[PDB]
Design a protein around this ligand. Structure first.
Ligand code: 0C9
Length: 264
């Protein structure tokens, strides 16, 4: 690295999105004309949530990991009242919008995203990095439409223990992370299972009206397949969404699954 920037090196463009600790803007590196994403955090909005030692992880991890399906993080710098992150810019938005845009995905688009996803995960896992936060809203799209994993905020070394207060929805967490038990790389395989189901049905398999009824549905692994989901998909999803971490497949089996060869 060896490059410390300032808000003055970038011409902020249109607001890409968000509203949490801050926003994400399209931005232009004045010197080289380079285009990227600049995510701003108000600093104050962070401290009062103690992410200090977690946003620290988001920045450090996502910085060293380099893979075509991982969103690259270039560097960062703090304002007088803020903290900006210099991220790779993903031209086609989040996968979350792609969904509200098509409702469901076909078996080739689902099989392909699941592929790129498994490869990308197999990499982080090659390095004991577990994401634990695979939402279709933490999945971007590169200029050629390839899936790109982002927001390694909840990322962590593994095997590990979850203190973590686990704020938002449970739609994507496995019985172990929700019943606050220990866990490993296998948590990212249950998530891959959910995504697959969501990419094909339009909603997650455990979706509920309350955090509490989802919690049940998850721990008891209670999910059903609408009539259109093909067998080959039910199979893979049923293989991934098994309660016992050790019984879920490896990524090879996922990248080799018969039905997975209905992609690109
Ligand atoms: O549709 C659009 O206009 C749209 C949405 C997304 C992108 N890409 C992009 N690139 C880099 C970072 C990034 N962060 C986010 C942007 C909005 C919401 C959440 C995030 C995030 O941090 O995951 N989003 C481009 C256009």
């Amino acid at each position: 690295k060896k490059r410390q920037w300032a808000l003055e090196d970038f011409e902020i463009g249109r607001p890409l999105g968000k509203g949490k600790f801050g926003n994400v803007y399209l931005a232009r590196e004045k010197q080289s004309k380079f285009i990227l994403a600049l995510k701003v955090l108000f600093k104050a909005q962070l401290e009062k949530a103690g992410v200090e030692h977690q946003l620290r992880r988001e920045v450090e991890i996502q910085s060293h990991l380099r893979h075509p399906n991982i969103l690259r993080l270039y560097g960062y710098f703090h304002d007088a009242t803020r903290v900006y992150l210099i991220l790779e810019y993903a031209p086609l938005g989040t996968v979350y919008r792609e969904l509200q845009k098509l409702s469901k995905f076909d078996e080739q688009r689902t099989a392909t995203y699941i592929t790129e996803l498994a490869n990308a995960l197999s990499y982080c896992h090659s390095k004991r990095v577990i994401h634990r936060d695979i939402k279709p809203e933490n999945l971007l799209l590169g200029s050629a439409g390839e899936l790109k994993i982002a927001d390694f905020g909840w990322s962590v070394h593994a095997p590990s223990s979850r203190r973590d207060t686990l704020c938002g929805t449970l739609d994507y967490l496995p019985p172990e992370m929700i019943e606050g038990r220990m866990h490993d790389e296998k948590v990212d395989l249950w998530s891959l299972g959910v995504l697959c189901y969501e990419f094909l049905v339009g909603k997650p398999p455990f979706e509920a009206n309350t955090y509490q009824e989802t919690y049940k549905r998850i721990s008891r692994v209670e999910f059903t397949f609408p009539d259109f989901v093909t067998e080959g998909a039910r199979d893979l999803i049923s293989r991934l969404l098994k309660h016992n971490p050790s019984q879920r497949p490896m990524l090879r089996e996922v990248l080799e699954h018969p039905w997975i060869t209905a992609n690109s």
